[PDB]
């Protein structure tokens, strides 16, 4: 694992400079395509893309797991929904499946800790049947977190060998907005009340209890904000760990990864704490409707492209943004040049 | 023309109600897909879509024209760029062409007033070689504006007969951000200084002159804010009129139209003033980086889905948003249902 973090490549400034120059000469007023231009340049600097903004195969990895904190009454969705939805992911009827299909991406469903019998068709990487209740103790041991990080990281960069050049991350786990809020609070130093949302339609009256649960988890576990793995193992979850693993793996592979919503922002905070070198590889997708989204994004210094007031999760936002990444590549490679049209601008 | 405005259909509340009910039962927490759900419902209410959110063929109409106000030194792009770019539109090397191709849409280039010889391949609907300099008089006569509105409206709804169900609007015209600002100022009652931007990279020092030009145009012409056609003919342009015509035509046809940037917001303000019934058919795309974007959008009560800091125009933003509209349709038709998975939520 120390080798993994050590070997994450820095961005290629040389390719980025060549990219910027090419974009400047395209058929349009310099800088007029805004964030589409900066995105293209960002892509060009990723070693796994061979010096140019390009998109080959696309995949969305959905990490599924159950949480012991569900027993604290922080979620109104039945716990069994995690397992039922995981199965639906194999039949292509879920939100992410439908949107990924639209973007031409393949969905990989991974079980990292569902509290149910194994589901045929789902990639098995389960650590245990649900993680520990963070309200009374740690979600898992440090060893379990490190082991999963490596496992998911390897699987991720392995897909790169199959032609995948663009990743999207997602999750599935009832009650996971609680550990997500805990992590955001710890990493950003914000009070729990400022980052606890209603998740999957939690009644406004049950919010108080959720905030209390978040504080108890932090108080009881005392996670170290400077240790991303300590935070993940103490107040995170198997799914959160898995998402962080995808980011570390894509980064090691020198490839881009599209974030999704609030759950993914929490995992990105951890990933960047563990290895700041991961940051240049992350691409935001949408601006989650979850209460603590603004805070999490500010700390990641990210501004999403899409404002859809979405809060489904599953990696649905990541899939919705894939066309945008392809659009930046199309602009770069297919637009004509000013010089060719004898157009000269100041 | 009075028949055109009179015959714009109201939205189908019955289909919208059936649409909402169906979306509520999909495999996800109610309302979790946010604006994707509201967009799907909006689409369902458009008569031309046959009671359901669907997208058939897509087309982006780019209105091209030159402006006499260019002589006032309000634009740094050579005037001939309008004609050169119009031609490039026929070869698919422009920004809109590349992005439309990515969305599977066809680009229709229409010359409504380019100050140059006719360009082969471009749809000819030119009123004159450039409109009048709005700084010293009106851009055109009321009769010329009404005639073009009808011509473009007919062409637009005619495409609906060819299978087109989704329109995008764009423009091409050096210096057109000046008349655009004038119109926005008049319709919103905002001071020119608050809505005049740098357009196609106008130097910060030349901004003052642009603001003065806008005020002179309004003072000299005295356009009536309550008369959308009066404003268009006095301080607008042929391209602006054409864009308004596409919106009136799509609305008459009961079909959706995706806006683009600031130029298109100005035209939408006029369209809705002329016929409020047009509003339910307009769909925003991105949030333009032009200074007066926030003001224009607030008056249209619109919140764009994309924040790309784009300011190229041509209808590039409209094309970039088409995948989003198709995504709302995919969600509606392809997602599974909660009842089928025995999932019951509060
Ligand atoms: C210069 C070059 C290309 C353009 N497309 C729209 N306005 C332009 C100005
Ligand atoms: C209920 C139904 C579908 C879901 N997908 C993600 N969380 C869910 C809760």
UniProtKB/Swiss-Prot annotation, chains A, B:
Source species, domain of life: Bacteria
EC number assigned by the record: 2.4.2.21
InterPro entries given in the database record: Nict_dMeBzImd_PRibTrfase, Nict_dMeBzImd_PRibTrfase_bact, Nict_dMeBzImd_PRibTrfase_N, Nict_dMeBzImd_PRibTrfase_sf
Enzyme type, top EC level: transferase
GO MF term set: nicotinate-nucleotide-dimethylbenzimidazole phosphoribosyltransferase activity; nucleotide binding
A single GO BP: cobalamin biosynthetic process
Outcome (variant: residue 85 to M): Alters specificity to use phenolic compounds as substrate
Changes seen on gene knockout: No growth on cobinamide (CBI); double cobB-cobT deletion mutants do not grow on CBI and DMB.
Site for Important for substrate positioning, might be proton acceptor, residues: 171, 314
Pathway named in the protein's UniProt entry: Nucleoside biosynthesis; alpha-ribazole biosynthesis; alpha-ribazole from 5,6-dimethylbenzimidazole: step 1/2
Keywords attached to this entry: Cobalamin biosynthesis, Glycosyltransferase, Nucleotide-binding, Transferase
Residues annotated to bind substrate: 85
Entry similarity comment: Belongs to the CobT family.
Known partners and oligomeric status: Homodimer.
Reported function: Catalyzes the synthesis of alpha-ribazole-5'-phosphate from nicotinate mononucleotide (NAMN) and 5,6-dimethylbenzimidazole (DMB). Able to use a variety of other nucleotide bases as substrate to create alternative lower ligands for cobamide.
Protein name, per record: Nicotinate-nucleotide--dimethylbenzimidazole phosphoribosyltransferase
Species: Salmonella typhimurium (strain LT2 / SGSC1412 / ATCC 700720)
């Amino acid at each position: 694992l120390h080798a993994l973090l050590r070997d994450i490549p820095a961005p290629d400034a040389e390719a980025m400079a060549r990219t910027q120059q090419h974009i400047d000469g395209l058929l349009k007023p310099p800088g007029s395509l805004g964030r589409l231009e900066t995105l293209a340049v960002q892509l060009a600097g990723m070693p796994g893309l061979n010096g140019t903004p390009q998109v080959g195969e696309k995949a969305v990895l959905v990490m599924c797991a159950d949480h012991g904190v569900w027993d604290e009454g922080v979620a109104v969705s039945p716990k069994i929904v995690t397992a039922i939805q995981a199965a639906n992911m194999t039949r292509g009827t879920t939100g992410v499946c439908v949107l990924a299909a639209q973007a031409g991406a393949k969905v990989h469903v991974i079980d990292v800790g569902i509290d149910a019998e194994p589901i045929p068709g789902v990639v098995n990487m389960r650590v245990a049947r649900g993680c520990g209740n963070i309200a009374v103790g740690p979600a898992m041991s440090r060893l379990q977190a490190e082991a999963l990080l490596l496992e998911v990281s390897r699987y991720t960069c392995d897909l790169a060998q199959r032609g995948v050049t663009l990743f999207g991350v997602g999750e599935l786990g009832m009650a996971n907005t609680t550990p997500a809020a805990a992590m955001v609070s710890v990493f950003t130093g914000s009070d729990a009340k400022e980052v606890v949302g209603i998740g999957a339609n939690l009644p406004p009256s049950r919010i108080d209890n959720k905030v209390d649960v978040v504080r108890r988890a932090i108080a009881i576990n005392q996670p170290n904000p400077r240790d991303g793995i300590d935070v993940l193992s103490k107040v995170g979850g198997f799914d959160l760990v898995g998402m962080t693993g995808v980011m570390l793996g894509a980064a090691r592979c020198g490839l881009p990864v599209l974030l999704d919503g609030f759950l993914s922002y929490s995992a990105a905070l951890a990933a960047c704490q563990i290895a700041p070198a991961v940051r240049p590889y992350l691409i935001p997708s949408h601006f989650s409707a979850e209460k603590g989204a603004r805070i999490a994004l500010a700390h990641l210094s990210m501004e999403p492209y899409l404002h859809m007031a979405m809060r489904l999760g599953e990696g649905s936002g990541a899939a919705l943004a894939m066309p945008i990444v392809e659009a930046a590549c199309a602009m770069f490679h297919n637009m004509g040049e000013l010089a060719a049209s004898n157009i000269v601008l100041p």
